Each structure stands twice: as structure tokens, then as C-alpha cells.
Amino acid sequence: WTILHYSPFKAVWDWLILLLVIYTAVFTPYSAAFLLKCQPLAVVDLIVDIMFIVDILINFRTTYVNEVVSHPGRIAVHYFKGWFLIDMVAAIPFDLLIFGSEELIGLLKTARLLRLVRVARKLDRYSEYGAAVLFLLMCTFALIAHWLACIWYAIGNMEQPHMDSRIGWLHNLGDQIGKPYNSSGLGGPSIKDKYVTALYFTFSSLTSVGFGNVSPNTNSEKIFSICVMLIGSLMYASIFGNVSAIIQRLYSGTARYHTQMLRVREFIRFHQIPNPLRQRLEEYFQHAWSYTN
Amino acid sequence: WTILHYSPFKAVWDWLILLLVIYTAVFTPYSAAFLLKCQPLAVVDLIVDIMFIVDILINFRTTYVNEVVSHPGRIAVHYFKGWFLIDMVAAIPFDLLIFGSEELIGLLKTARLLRLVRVARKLDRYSEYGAAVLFLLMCTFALIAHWLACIWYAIGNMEQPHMDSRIGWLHNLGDQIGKPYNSSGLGGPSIKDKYVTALYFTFSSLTSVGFGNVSPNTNSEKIFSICVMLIGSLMYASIFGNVSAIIQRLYSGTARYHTQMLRVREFIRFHQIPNPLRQRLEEYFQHAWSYTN
Amino acid sequence: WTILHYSPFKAVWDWLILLLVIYTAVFTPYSAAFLLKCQPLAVVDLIVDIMFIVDILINFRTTYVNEVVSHPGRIAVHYFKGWFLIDMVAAIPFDLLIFGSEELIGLLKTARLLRLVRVARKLDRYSEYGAAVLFLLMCTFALIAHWLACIWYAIGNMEQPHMDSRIGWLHNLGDQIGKPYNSSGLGGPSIKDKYVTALYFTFSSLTSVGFGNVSPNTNSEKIFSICVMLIGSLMYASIFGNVSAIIQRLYSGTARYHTQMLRVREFIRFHQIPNPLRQRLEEYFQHAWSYTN
Amino acid sequence: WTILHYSPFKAVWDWLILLLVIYTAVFTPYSAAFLLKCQPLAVVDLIVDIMFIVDILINFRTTYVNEVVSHPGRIAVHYFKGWFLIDMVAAIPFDLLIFGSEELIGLLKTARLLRLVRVARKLDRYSEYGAAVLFLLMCTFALIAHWLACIWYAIGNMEQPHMDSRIGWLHNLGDQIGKPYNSSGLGGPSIKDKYVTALYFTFSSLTSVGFGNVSPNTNSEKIFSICVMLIGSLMYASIFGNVSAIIQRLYSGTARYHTQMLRVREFIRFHQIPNPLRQRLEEYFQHAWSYTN
């Protein structure tokens, strides 16, 4: 057997894999930055890795446009010429492959971020609807804020063993919430306090609010903040350009309607059309527009 | 008898009900957030509830387009099979109906915010005039900034009995204005000091100024500011996109005029037209424009 | 004799009166806010009051379009039935007329801000040129920032005799620059330190930077800052909308050129035009473009 | 011999001189602000000054358009009646000419900033490609942010020997990073700490984040910040106006495609086309578009 790329199954499967790419893009950077020194986030990662492997089996059993191609030999050779290498590197079980330090095993699973390429391959499906691309733009924005929160925590944390003597953002967080770092390294804020503050700071830098209770203080935090300001400005010229243009695309029926209504009303005022005739003109435009848009 | 939906009474009544929906959108969230534990606002809420009940009787005695339907049975069944459920729920006298704690009696009146649906139903009347839709957009911005100020006060206040040990924004307000909270729970800022500071903080986060004397410090305050940064950026792509478009629509006569003027001016440069002829061309453009628009 | 409204004298006089309106819009708010309790600014104000009086005499001797009307009686009655009242109220010298406290005598000169109406009447002269309207938009922004600096200092100063007990922005300025107010009310920042700080805070609020060393702290300063954030957002939808649109209008030759060049380039790529013919097409486009625009 | 201005050598040379102008725009303002009183930045400046002299010899031996002109006498007189004066002043070795204080000798090398004119002459070469004009816009922004960081350090540094008594931004930097100044007016932050903080402050002001741990405190720092807020708002109305327009210009193939797809989709909904015909319509649109754009 072989699966048609326009079938109602393969359409729903491509929309389901988007949610497992969004899951990967959230929980992989978080586990790589915050959690490194059954669990639901161990077994759900195993379930999700099995589905990203089943998607390789579906890619060996899908038709594709050259006219459609429907022979398993002409399907398999096209997947090997195309994306199979990137898809297999995104599927190696590195957690089972080596036992080789635990820091390397924790970091190396960031190779799963190659699963973001399974969205770039399929924008011809996902971008078709205005309400779907507006959701992808807000998830692109919230994921870029989350990835920068994981980098901002990695920067804030790596300056404690290469010790600063109480300058970097984690010491200031400890004081501001009344959970200070003791000189033994004991105490300090929880992973919720550190994550929520890092996400708050990077939405505050990207959306340009800059609240000034978290503020960058060491040179690596300042050089990171210059990079977040260069990313945030290119992104506001692009994402919140396209969200405004997509709202204007949905609103385009109303914008055209009021433009043609204003022309009809201005014509009616310029000629001072008598009421017995004017009502026939301004009712006809509403009828004709309601039929043909 | 029956009322025609285009009549000058029903037109003025639908513009009066916009001002009473704006009153409900202001003083209901304020009473639910700041005033929990006759007065002028206790009698004015009774007068306004009577007018929102009179508006239900008008909705049983108004015509609608199938042209118009003008039989009370065909009117009433259309209202029951439409908006009557929301309209009557938005008029239940919960201030009298139960005796059942006084906090819940005060909170349950927030069901009156269903009166905002009486504006969404009538955007065919309200959006027609450029100065009226520009007014609505500035009131949607000011009402969202006010509703967020009521949530920001509810968050800042509920963390005092869920005691924080002096971390949340109301303790910082007490120390900043020289009206501290005593350790006995006495003193602290007045309702004007707390409301004006809450409204100042939500305009500061929405317009992205971020003044840094009020800043979010506990995790619920930081999670709220992440939500206000997402609301504020979607609202700047939408409201201050549409306000700039309506400003350009009011400017459209001037924009067309200068665009046609530049074509005529460049034509007169390109052919180097002699003055006696140039004045005839360039005066004719001003007549033909100021006559025909 | 009588003066033609299109003459080179009346063109230069209308462009000179713009500079004396810009002078009035600067030095009247400043003298009313900062300098209350002959000099160079007193004699320049007298010279400028004489020129705004001479402009009333020119308005009694200028032609106007009904063809142009040139009889002095038909000119004078048209000016009296028009702007003469506002032009005379903007010219009555209340300072020289009076013989009742000197605070009111200094404040009453703010009637000179009616001279801003002598710009709004003449936008058909001033808005014609792209470099002139871009200058008017930047001076409208810099004058709105200056008028708000004068209101912000009037608020900050009135709360010292209506005493705050050391809360408002002037006490914090004293501590920050090392010029504290003494306990007797003696000393404190100079008029330069106070003005440059008030102008800095209002550019910081309007452009939304919010630097957080000056921040609003009493309720009148917070209510003013809410007003500046509503002014600043409507103004960024309008002024920095129109400045960007005028920059696009100045760029419109280059924008049309690249749009037609991209069409000709895309056509040449699609048909794979051989080089001997490619150069002829691609040069002819540049000749036809640079000749006719 | 003589060089044709469209040849692949002269194309590569004009793209190489853009990189040496970008190097000049970085390392000359930096050396003039931070380093006042062979190694890499002595020998690389010698190599680059020799290449800007070799470019003068190329400018005497290149063809130009009046139709092309190729006689060395008609080339040389066109360069002498054109840019040769600016190109010679941008190449005088003032460091070898004078032997009178060394502060002026170091500052006088800022004459090399006339090399920015060698980019402004050649925008007809560089602006042709959409990726190249987007790169020039981001480097124009990052170079304005760098030049303002050199002025901001010159202001912050000159008020230490013209002593402030502990007010300006460099004293605050020393206290924040754990490197306080000695009472002699000496020691404290390194050139990395001072440069990275100055560049962080000008991106913070230009992108309007305003982080509030660096803030202007003396009057020269406040007057500078008012100028940066006027430059930053004109620049965001112009540079990030153009970057968002260039992103929409690159996206114009997709924007035209989806607008034409939506017109076809709306037509197919309006007539309710049966599936055996509908597929042929929407498949033909995809063929016709992917063939001709």
C-alpha cells in the first residue's frame, strides 16, 4: 500500500506533527538549560520520539508531485535525495547510545531541534489559512522569547562557577524576592522563580518595555542584550509587520466595502440625489456587495 | 405599535446605549476589584439597569430585515431564537436575588459585562462614520487598560493575605508615596493612590514605556506582565494599525489631491510649459478638484 | 495701493511669520512656566509684537479669491467678518495695558498662543513642499514636547507650596544631581537643570524610552503621565505615520524605478533574452525612465 | 590602458571598497574616542590607507558615461571637476605631516570619515540587490549606534577632568560592576567595560528599550539623550520603514500569489463549482502562476 499526500489522513497527520514540533521546541531547550545538574517528561519524550520515527515510515510510504508519483522505489529514492538524512539525525536515541558524561548526554539531545525543519518543508500546507498563519506568527514569537530565556539563564548561571562576586542577574534576583544566595551556594531562587524571571526579561527586551528591575550588568549580559535588541527590531519589522498585514487581509472585505460605500455616498452627495431615488441606489449597493463581495 | 429600525428614535437610542455600555464597562470592573469587603453610584446603577431592561422591551417592538418584517409574533420569535438569552442574563437582579456571601453578591454582578455584546451586535450602525470609529478605538484602548488595572490590583492585593513578606507591588507603593503599611496591617495607600498607580502601570506596559518605579516582583505579577506584553503587542498591530488607517482615510482627500498635483506638476516641468498656458492648466486642476473631489 | 496674495513679497512675509510663530510657541510657554516671580527677551518680544501688529495692517491690504477681489472696502469687510477678532486678541498688549497681581499679568500673555492659528490658516502655502511639511512635522513634535515640559514643571512646582513632604520629581532631581533642597526650602536645582530635565522626561515619555531616573511619583504626576501616553500614542499613529509617508513620497521615484526594473528583469529572466538584445531592452528602460520620470 | 566600469574586476573592487569603508566607519571613531593619550591596528590601517590610495589611481583609469567616455584626458578632467578633492583629503597621511599636541594629531585622523562618500557615490551599484540593501540598512543602523557610543563615551569621559563631583555615567559604572574609581579620579572600569556599556546604552536608547541601569544624569548627558531620541525616532520612521518594506518586497511573490489564490477561491465559493471541474481550475492556477509569476 501507499498513502496519498492530499488524503484526509495525511492532512491530519501533518497538522498533528506541528503540535509535536511545538512540544519539542518548548521542552527540549528547557530541559537543556534549566534541568541539567516514571517522570511524565521522560515517558512523553519517548512517546514523541516514537511518533517522529513513525513519521519516517510514513515518508517512505507517501505519494509526491514530480504529476503524482506512486511507486515505492521512486518514493524511497526521492526521500534519500531529499530530507532523510536530517530526519534520521533528528531521530538517533542519544540517551541510549552512550553512558559519555551526563552533561554531554543532556546537551546532545538539543539535536532534536532539527525537527523544526519539518515545519519549513510544509509551509505550503500550514500558510494557506489566515487564522492558522496568525497562530504560527504568535507561536514563532513566544518560541523566540522562550529560546532567548534559556540562553539568558545559561549566561546568568555559567558566571556563578566562573565566579563574579555578586554582579550578575541571578544574585540580584535572589535579593529582590527575599531568597538570597548564601556564601556556601545554598538557598537562592527556585527553578520557577528563575525561569519565570528569564522569560519575563526576554519578553521585556523583545517587546521593548524594559522594566528595569531585571537589568543586564556583566559584559556577557550586555552583549547578549545588544543581540536581543538587534533580533527584536528585525522581528518587529517582520512578525508584527505580517500580523498587522494578516489582520488587514481578514479586514480587507470591510476595507473594500467602506471604500466603495464612501464612493457611492460621495457621488450621492455631489449630485444631491432625491430621497425616492437615493434609497434605491444605496440599497442596491448593499444587495450587490452582499452577493458578490 | 412597532418601531422601525432606521427611525431617528431608534438611531438615537442605539447611540445612547453605547454611552451606557461604556458606563458598565468602567464602573462594574472597578466595583468588583476595588470596593469589595443611597450612594450616587448605587442610584445611577439602578437607573442604568432600568434602561438596559427598557432596551429588552424595545427589542420585542423593533422591525428587522428578513426587506423588513413588521409582525410582533415574527419579531418576538426571532429575538428568542437569537440574542434574548444574553440580554436577559445581563439583567438578572443578583444584588437582590440571594442573601450567598456579600463578596459573592458583589462579584456575581460582573455578569453585567455581557452588555458589551450589545455593542458587537450594532457595528453596522457605529462603524459607518470615521470620527465615531476613531472614538471607539480610543475607548477600546482605554477600557482594556482599565480592565487590566483591575486585574493588576486583584493580583497585587490577593498576595497580602496569601502573605509574601513585603515583596508585591502594594508594599512598594506604600514605601514610595510615604504611606507605608504598618506590621499590624493598618495604614497603607488610599483607593485613589492604588487605582491611579494600577492604571498608570497598565498604560506604562501597554504603550511600552515601562517607567521602572512600579515593576512586577512576585511570580504572579511577572506572569501577568508576560500576558500584558502579548495583549499590548497584538493590540498595537490592531488598534494603532486601524487608528493610523482611519487617520489616513480622513486624510485621503489630501493624499489624492497631492498625488494628482504631483503628476500635473511633473508634467508641467517635463514639457516646460509657458506661464500664460501654465496658469490655465494649474488653475483648472484646482477648479476640477474642488468641484468633483 | 493693495498687495497681491500670490506676490513674491507676500510669499516671503508668510514664510517669515512662520518663524515668528515658532518663536512665540517656544518663548511664551517658557516665560509663563519658568520665569514667573529692557531685557534682551523683553525687547525681542516687543519687536515681534510689532511685527504681528504690522501683519494685521497687511491683512487689511491683501487681495483674496471670491477671480481675486481688490477693492479695499471688500477686503476690509471680509477680514472683519473673518479672522480679525482672533488676530486682535493675539495682539492686545495686556502687559502694557494694565495699571491685578503681577502673576496674572505674566500668565495673561499666554493669549499670544492664538498666533498658532496664523499657521493653521495658511497650510495651502506651507504644505506644498515635501521638505517644508517634513520640517513642520518635526517642529510640531519638538513643540509638543516643549509644551508638555512646561506643564510638567508647572505640576512639579505647584506641589512644593501645596507641600508634598518630599515625594515629587523636583526633590528627587535635587538628590540625583547633588543639589538637594535645604530644610528651609533654600537651594535646589537651577532653571537649566529643571528645564533640561523636564524636556528630557517628556521626550522620554513621548518616544516611549522611559529611562526611569525621572519617574512620576505623586498622583498628579501619574495622571499627567497617563495623559502623555495617550497623546504620545495618537501622535505616533499620526506624526511618525506622516513623516514615514512623506519619506516614502520623496522615495517614490526610486520606488517606482525599482518596481518597473524588477518587472523588466523578471521578464528578461523568464524569456531568457540573449545579451545583445538584453542590453538594448535594459538600457532603453533607463533612457525612457530618466527622460520622462 | 583603461578599465571598463561595468567589468567584473571593477564590480568586485567596488564591493571590496564597501568593506574597507565599513572598517573605516568602525575603527576610526573607536580610535578617536577610546584610545587617545607594527601592531595589528597600525599595520591594517597602513594596508587599508594604501588601498584607498590605489582606488584614486583606479578612479583616474576608469571609463564613465557622458554614452561611454574613454580618453584619459576626458576621464581625468571629469574626476578633478568631481570627487577628487574629497578623495584626496580622505587620503592625506596627517600622522606623518605634523610633529601641535598629540590629542589633536589623534583626533585629526577622523578626516578618514570622508570615505563614507565613496559609498554614497555608488548606491546605483549597491541598491540593485534586495539582500544587499537590507544588509546596508542593518549596517547603517549598527554604525549609527556605534558612532553615538563614541560620542557618549567622549561626553562621559570629558566631565571627569572637568570634574562633576561624582554625578556622570562613568562613576555609576564603576560602582555597579564592582570596580569603583579611586579618590584620585583614576582606575576603575576597563576599555571593554566602558565600550560595551556605551554601545549597550545607545542601542537601548535607539531601539527605545531604556533599561534604566545606565541613565543620563548631568545636563550634557540629558541634552545628548534628547538628540538620540530625535535621531532614533527619525531613524525608526526611515531605516525600519525601509527594512519592513524590503521584507514585503522579497515576500511580494508570495503576497501576489495568495491574493490571486484568494480571488480564485472566492470565485469558486460564489459559483459552488463541482469537484471534477474545481480541481482543474485550482490546479491550472498553480501551473500558470509557477510558470510565469
Short mmCIF file of N, CA, C and O in Angstrom, two decimals, chain B residues 40-132:
data_model
loop_
_atom_site.label_atom_id
_atom_site.label_comp_id
_atom_site.label_asym_id
_atom_site.label_seq_id
_atom_site.Cartn_x
_atom_site.Cartn_y
_atom_site.Cartn_z
N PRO B 40 -24.46 57.93 45.29
CA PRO B 40 -24.70 58.34 43.90
C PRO B 40 -24.55 57.20 42.88
O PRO B 40 -25.44 56.99 42.06
N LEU B 41 -23.47 56.41 42.94
CA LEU B 41 -23.29 55.29 42.02
C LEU B 41 -24.24 54.11 42.29
O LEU B 41 -24.52 53.33 41.39
N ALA B 42 -24.79 53.98 43.51
CA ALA B 42 -25.80 52.96 43.81
C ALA B 42 -27.17 53.30 43.20
O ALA B 42 -27.87 52.40 42.74
N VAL B 43 -27.56 54.58 43.13
CA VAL B 43 -28.76 55.00 42.40
C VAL B 43 -28.53 55.07 40.88
O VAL B 43 -29.39 54.62 40.12
N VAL B 44 -27.37 55.53 40.41
CA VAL B 44 -27.08 55.56 38.96
C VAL B 44 -27.01 54.15 38.37
O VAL B 44 -27.57 53.93 37.31
N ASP B 45 -26.44 53.16 39.07
CA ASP B 45 -26.52 51.77 38.61
C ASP B 45 -27.97 51.25 38.52
O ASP B 45 -28.28 50.48 37.61
N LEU B 46 -28.86 51.67 39.42
CA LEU B 46 -30.28 51.29 39.35
C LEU B 46 -30.97 51.93 38.14
O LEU B 46 -31.66 51.24 37.39
N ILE B 47 -30.75 53.23 37.89
CA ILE B 47 -31.25 53.93 36.71
C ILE B 47 -30.75 53.27 35.42
O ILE B 47 -31.54 53.01 34.50
N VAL B 48 -29.46 52.96 35.33
CA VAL B 48 -28.87 52.31 34.16
C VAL B 48 -29.38 50.87 33.99
O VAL B 48 -29.71 50.49 32.87
N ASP B 49 -29.55 50.09 35.05
CA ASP B 49 -30.20 48.77 34.95
C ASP B 49 -31.64 48.88 34.43
O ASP B 49 -32.04 48.08 33.58
N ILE B 50 -32.41 49.88 34.86
CA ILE B 50 -33.75 50.12 34.31
C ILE B 50 -33.68 50.41 32.81
O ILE B 50 -34.44 49.82 32.05
N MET B 51 -32.75 51.25 32.33
CA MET B 51 -32.62 51.49 30.89
C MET B 51 -32.18 50.25 30.11
O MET B 51 -32.70 50.00 29.03
N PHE B 52 -31.29 49.40 30.64
CA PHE B 52 -30.97 48.14 29.98
C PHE B 52 -32.12 47.11 30.02
O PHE B 52 -32.11 46.21 29.18
N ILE B 53 -33.11 47.24 30.91
CA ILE B 53 -34.37 46.48 30.86
C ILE B 53 -35.35 47.08 29.84
O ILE B 53 -35.92 46.34 29.04
N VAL B 54 -35.52 48.40 29.80
CA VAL B 54 -36.32 49.09 28.77
C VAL B 54 -35.84 48.72 27.36
O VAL B 54 -36.65 48.46 26.48
N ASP B 55 -34.53 48.61 27.16
CA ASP B 55 -33.97 48.15 25.89
C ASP B 55 -34.37 46.71 25.52
O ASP B 55 -34.48 46.40 24.33
N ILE B 56 -34.67 45.82 26.47
CA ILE B 56 -35.23 44.49 26.15
C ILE B 56 -36.65 44.65 25.59
O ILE B 56 -36.99 44.03 24.59
N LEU B 57 -37.48 45.51 26.19
CA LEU B 57 -38.83 45.77 25.68
C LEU B 57 -38.80 46.37 24.27
O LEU B 57 -39.54 45.92 23.40
N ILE B 58 -37.89 47.32 24.00
CA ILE B 58 -37.68 47.84 22.64
C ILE B 58 -37.27 46.72 21.67
O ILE B 58 -37.78 46.67 20.55
N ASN B 59 -36.43 45.77 22.07
CA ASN B 59 -36.05 44.65 21.21
C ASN B 59 -37.20 43.67 20.91
O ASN B 59 -37.14 42.96 19.91
N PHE B 60 -38.29 43.66 21.70
CA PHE B 60 -39.54 42.96 21.34
C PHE B 60 -40.48 43.78 20.44
O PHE B 60 -41.49 43.25 19.96
N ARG B 61 -40.19 45.06 20.20
CA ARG B 61 -41.05 46.01 19.46
C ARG B 61 -40.28 46.78 18.37
O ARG B 61 -40.65 47.90 18.04
N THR B 62 -39.26 46.17 17.79
CA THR B 62 -38.47 46.73 16.67
C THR B 62 -38.52 45.81 15.45
O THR B 62 -38.47 44.59 15.60
N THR B 63 -38.61 46.37 14.24
CA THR B 63 -38.54 45.59 12.99
C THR B 63 -37.12 45.06 12.71
O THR B 63 -36.15 45.54 13.29
N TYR B 64 -36.99 44.09 11.80
CA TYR B 64 -35.70 43.56 11.33
C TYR B 64 -35.80 43.12 9.86
O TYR B 64 -36.90 42.83 9.38
N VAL B 65 -34.69 43.06 9.13
CA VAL B 65 -34.66 42.63 7.72
C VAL B 65 -34.72 41.11 7.60
O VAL B 65 -33.95 40.40 8.26
N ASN B 66 -35.58 40.58 6.73
CA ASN B 66 -35.75 39.13 6.51
C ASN B 66 -34.44 38.46 6.06
O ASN B 66 -34.39 37.24 5.85
N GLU B 67 -36.42 42.59 2.64
CA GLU B 67 -37.00 43.77 3.30
C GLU B 67 -37.55 43.47 4.71
O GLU B 67 -37.43 42.36 5.22
N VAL B 68 -38.08 44.50 5.38
CA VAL B 68 -38.46 44.48 6.79
C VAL B 68 -39.58 43.49 7.12
O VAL B 68 -40.51 43.29 6.35
N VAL B 69 -39.51 42.93 8.32
CA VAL B 69 -40.56 42.14 8.97
C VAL B 69 -41.22 42.98 10.06
O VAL B 69 -40.53 43.55 10.90
N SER B 70 -42.55 43.07 10.06
CA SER B 70 -43.31 44.05 10.85
C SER B 70 -44.51 43.46 11.62
O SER B 70 -45.46 44.17 11.94
N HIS B 71 -44.48 42.16 11.93
CA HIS B 71 -45.49 41.49 12.76
C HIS B 71 -44.90 41.07 14.12
O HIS B 71 -43.90 40.35 14.14
N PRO B 72 -45.48 41.48 15.27
CA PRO B 72 -44.93 41.22 16.60
C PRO B 72 -44.59 39.76 16.91
O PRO B 72 -43.62 39.50 17.62
N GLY B 73 -45.33 38.79 16.36
CA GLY B 73 -45.02 37.37 16.53
C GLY B 73 -43.72 36.96 15.84
O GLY B 73 -42.86 36.31 16.44
N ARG B 74 -43.53 37.41 14.59
CA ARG B 74 -42.30 37.15 13.80
C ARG B 74 -41.09 37.93 14.33
O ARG B 74 -39.96 37.49 14.14
N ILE B 75 -41.31 39.07 15.00
CA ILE B 75 -40.28 39.80 15.76
C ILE B 75 -39.88 39.02 17.02
O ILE B 75 -38.72 38.65 17.18
N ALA B 76 -40.83 38.72 17.90
CA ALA B 76 -40.54 38.09 19.19
C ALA B 76 -39.87 36.72 19.05
O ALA B 76 -38.88 36.46 19.73
N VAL B 77 -40.33 35.86 18.14
CA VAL B 77 -39.70 34.54 17.92
C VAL B 77 -38.27 34.66 17.38
O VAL B 77 -37.42 33.85 17.75
N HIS B 78 -37.97 35.68 16.57
CA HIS B 78 -36.60 35.93 16.09
C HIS B 78 -35.67 36.39 17.22
O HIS B 78 -34.53 35.94 17.28
N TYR B 79 -36.17 37.20 18.16
CA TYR B 79 -35.39 37.61 19.33
C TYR B 79 -35.14 36.46 20.31
O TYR B 79 -34.00 36.25 20.72
N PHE B 80 -36.15 35.64 20.63
CA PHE B 80 -35.97 34.43 21.45
C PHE B 80 -34.98 33.44 20.81
O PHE B 80 -34.13 32.91 21.51
N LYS B 81 -35.05 33.22 19.50
CA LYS B 81 -34.12 32.34 18.76
C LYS B 81 -32.77 33.01 18.43
O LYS B 81 -31.98 32.46 17.67
N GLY B 82 -32.51 34.18 19.01
CA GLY B 82 -31.27 34.96 18.84
C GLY B 82 -30.71 35.42 20.19
O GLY B 82 -30.31 34.62 21.03
N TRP B 83 -30.62 36.74 20.38
CA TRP B 83 -29.87 37.34 21.48
C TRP B 83 -30.61 37.47 22.82
O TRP B 83 -29.99 37.88 23.80
N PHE B 84 -31.90 37.13 22.93
CA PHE B 84 -32.66 37.33 24.18
C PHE B 84 -32.03 36.64 25.39
O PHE B 84 -32.06 37.20 26.49
N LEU B 85 -31.42 35.46 25.22
CA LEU B 85 -30.78 34.74 26.32
C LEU B 85 -29.68 35.58 26.99
O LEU B 85 -29.70 35.79 28.20
N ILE B 86 -28.75 36.11 26.19
CA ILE B 86 -27.69 37.01 26.66
C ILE B 86 -28.27 38.30 27.23
O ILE B 86 -27.84 38.75 28.29
N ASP B 87 -29.26 38.90 26.57
CA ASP B 87 -29.85 40.15 27.06
C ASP B 87 -30.55 40.02 28.40
O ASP B 87 -30.42 40.92 29.23
N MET B 88 -31.27 38.92 28.66
CA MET B 88 -31.94 38.75 29.95
C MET B 88 -30.97 38.33 31.06
O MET B 88 -31.07 38.84 32.18
N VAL B 89 -29.96 37.49 30.77
CA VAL B 89 -28.89 37.16 31.73
C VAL B 89 -28.14 38.42 32.19
O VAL B 89 -27.91 38.60 33.38
N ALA B 90 -27.86 39.35 31.27
CA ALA B 90 -27.28 40.66 31.57
C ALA B 90 -28.22 41.64 32.33
O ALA B 90 -27.89 42.82 32.47
N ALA B 91 -29.37 41.18 32.83
CA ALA B 91 -30.35 41.99 33.56
C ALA B 91 -30.94 41.30 34.81
O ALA B 91 -31.80 41.88 35.48
N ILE B 92 -30.49 40.09 35.17
CA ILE B 92 -30.92 39.41 36.41
C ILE B 92 -30.46 40.23 37.64
O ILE B 92 -29.27 40.54 37.74
N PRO B 93 -31.35 40.58 38.59
CA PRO B 93 -31.02 41.43 39.74
C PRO B 93 -30.31 40.65 40.86
O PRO B 93 -30.82 40.52 41.98
N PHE B 94 -29.11 40.13 40.60
CA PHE B 94 -28.33 39.36 41.58
C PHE B 94 -27.98 40.12 42.87
O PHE B 94 -27.69 39.50 43.89
N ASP B 95 -28.06 41.46 42.87
CA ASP B 95 -27.92 42.29 44.08
C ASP B 95 -29.07 42.08 45.10
O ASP B 95 -28.93 42.37 46.28
N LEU B 96 -30.23 41.58 44.63
CA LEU B 96 -31.42 41.29 45.43
C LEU B 96 -31.71 39.78 45.56
O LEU B 96 -32.34 39.36 46.53
N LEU B 97 -31.31 38.98 44.57
CA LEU B 97 -31.78 37.60 44.38
C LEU B 97 -31.33 36.60 45.47
O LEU B 97 -31.98 35.56 45.63
N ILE B 98 -30.26 36.88 46.21
CA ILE B 98 -29.67 35.95 47.19
C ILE B 98 -29.13 36.68 48.44
O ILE B 98 -28.79 37.86 48.38
N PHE B 99 -29.07 35.98 49.57
CA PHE B 99 -28.69 36.51 50.89
C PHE B 99 -27.63 35.64 51.57
O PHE B 99 -27.79 34.41 51.67
N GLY B 100 -24.04 32.64 49.09
CA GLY B 100 -24.87 33.82 49.38
C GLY B 100 -24.14 34.95 50.12
O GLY B 100 -24.77 35.92 50.54
N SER B 101 -22.82 34.84 50.30
CA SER B 101 -21.97 35.83 50.97
C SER B 101 -21.88 37.16 50.20
O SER B 101 -21.92 37.18 48.97
N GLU B 102 -21.70 38.27 50.90
CA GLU B 102 -21.67 39.62 50.33
C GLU B 102 -20.53 39.85 49.32
O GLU B 102 -20.71 40.58 48.34
N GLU B 103 -19.39 39.18 49.49
CA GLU B 103 -18.32 39.14 48.49
C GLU B 103 -18.79 38.51 47.16
O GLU B 103 -18.59 39.08 46.09
N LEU B 104 -19.47 37.36 47.23
CA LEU B 104 -20.00 36.69 46.04
C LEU B 104 -21.14 37.50 45.40
O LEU B 104 -21.18 37.60 44.18
N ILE B 105 -22.01 38.14 46.19
CA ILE B 105 -23.05 39.05 45.66
C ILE B 105 -22.42 40.21 44.87
O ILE B 105 -22.86 40.53 43.77
N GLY B 106 -21.35 40.81 45.40
CA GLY B 106 -20.61 41.86 44.70
C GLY B 106 -19.88 41.37 43.45
O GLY B 106 -19.90 42.05 42.42
N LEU B 107 -19.28 40.18 43.49
CA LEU B 107 -18.57 39.58 42.35
C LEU B 107 -19.51 39.12 41.23
O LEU B 107 -19.20 39.30 40.05
N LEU B 108 -20.67 38.56 41.57
CA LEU B 108 -21.62 38.00 40.61
C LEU B 108 -22.22 39.05 39.66
O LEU B 108 -22.52 38.75 38.51
N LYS B 109 -22.31 40.32 40.09
CA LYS B 109 -22.68 41.45 39.22
C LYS B 109 -21.75 41.67 38.03
O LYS B 109 -22.15 42.31 37.07
N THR B 110 -20.54 41.09 38.01
CA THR B 110 -19.69 41.10 36.80
C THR B 110 -20.34 40.43 35.59
O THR B 110 -19.92 40.71 34.47
N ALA B 111 -21.41 39.65 35.75
CA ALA B 111 -22.24 39.19 34.62
C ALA B 111 -22.77 40.35 33.75
O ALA B 111 -22.96 40.16 32.55
N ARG B 112 -22.94 41.56 34.30
CA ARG B 112 -23.29 42.77 33.53
C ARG B 112 -22.33 43.07 32.38
O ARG B 112 -22.73 43.73 31.43
N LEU B 113 -21.09 42.57 32.39
CA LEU B 113 -20.17 42.73 31.26
C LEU B 113 -20.65 42.03 29.97
O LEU B 113 -20.17 42.36 28.89
N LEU B 114 -21.66 41.15 30.03
CA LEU B 114 -22.36 40.69 28.83
C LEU B 114 -23.05 41.83 28.05
O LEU B 114 -23.31 41.68 26.86
N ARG B 115 -23.29 43.00 28.65
CA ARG B 115 -23.78 44.18 27.92
C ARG B 115 -22.82 44.66 26.83
O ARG B 115 -23.29 45.27 25.87
N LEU B 116 -21.53 44.34 26.89
CA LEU B 116 -20.59 44.63 25.79
C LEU B 116 -21.04 43.95 24.48
O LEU B 116 -20.79 44.49 23.40
N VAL B 117 -21.77 42.84 24.53
CA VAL B 117 -22.33 42.18 23.34
C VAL B 117 -23.34 43.07 22.61
O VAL B 117 -23.41 43.04 21.38
N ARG B 118 -24.07 43.96 23.31
CA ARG B 118 -24.98 44.95 22.69
C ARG B 118 -24.26 45.99 21.84
O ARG B 118 -24.91 46.62 21.01
N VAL B 119 -22.94 46.14 21.97
CA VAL B 119 -22.12 46.94 21.04
C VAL B 119 -21.65 46.11 19.84
O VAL B 119 -21.79 46.55 18.71
N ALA B 120 -21.19 44.88 20.05
CA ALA B 120 -20.75 43.99 18.97
C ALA B 120 -21.87 43.67 17.95
O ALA B 120 -21.61 43.57 16.75
N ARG B 121 -23.13 43.57 18.40
CA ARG B 121 -24.31 43.39 17.54
C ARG B 121 -24.63 44.55 16.60
O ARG B 121 -25.38 44.35 15.64
N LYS B 122 -24.12 45.75 16.87
CA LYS B 122 -24.55 47.00 16.24
C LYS B 122 -23.41 47.73 15.52
O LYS B 122 -23.51 48.92 15.24
N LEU B 123 -22.32 47.04 15.20
CA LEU B 123 -21.18 47.63 14.49
C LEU B 123 -21.54 48.12 13.09
O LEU B 123 -20.85 49.00 12.57
N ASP B 124 -22.62 47.63 12.48
CA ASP B 124 -23.16 48.20 11.24
C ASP B 124 -23.63 49.66 11.41
O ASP B 124 -23.44 50.46 10.50
N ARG B 125 -24.18 50.04 12.57
CA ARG B 125 -24.50 51.43 12.89
C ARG B 125 -23.26 52.22 13.28
O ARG B 125 -23.05 53.32 12.77
N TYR B 126 -22.44 51.71 14.20
CA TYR B 126 -21.38 52.51 14.80
C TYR B 126 -20.15 52.72 13.91
O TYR B 126 -19.53 53.78 13.97
N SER B 127 -19.77 51.75 13.07
CA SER B 127 -18.57 51.85 12.24
C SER B 127 -18.71 52.75 11.00
O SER B 127 -17.73 53.01 10.31
N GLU B 128 -19.91 53.25 10.71
CA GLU B 128 -20.21 53.97 9.46
C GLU B 128 -19.49 55.32 9.33
O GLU B 128 -19.14 55.73 8.22
N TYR B 129 -19.23 56.01 10.45
CA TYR B 129 -18.67 57.37 10.47
C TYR B 129 -17.24 57.39 11.01
O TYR B 129 -16.97 56.89 12.10
N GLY B 130 -16.30 58.01 10.29
CA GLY B 130 -14.86 57.95 10.60
C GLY B 130 -14.49 58.47 11.98
O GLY B 130 -13.73 57.82 12.71
N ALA B 131 -15.06 59.59 12.42
CA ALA B 131 -14.82 60.12 13.76
C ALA B 131 -15.39 59.23 14.88
O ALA B 131 -14.84 59.18 15.98
N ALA B 132 -16.47 58.49 14.62
CA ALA B 132 -17.08 57.60 15.60
C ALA B 132 -16.28 56.30 15.77
O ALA B 132 -16.07 55.87 16.90
#
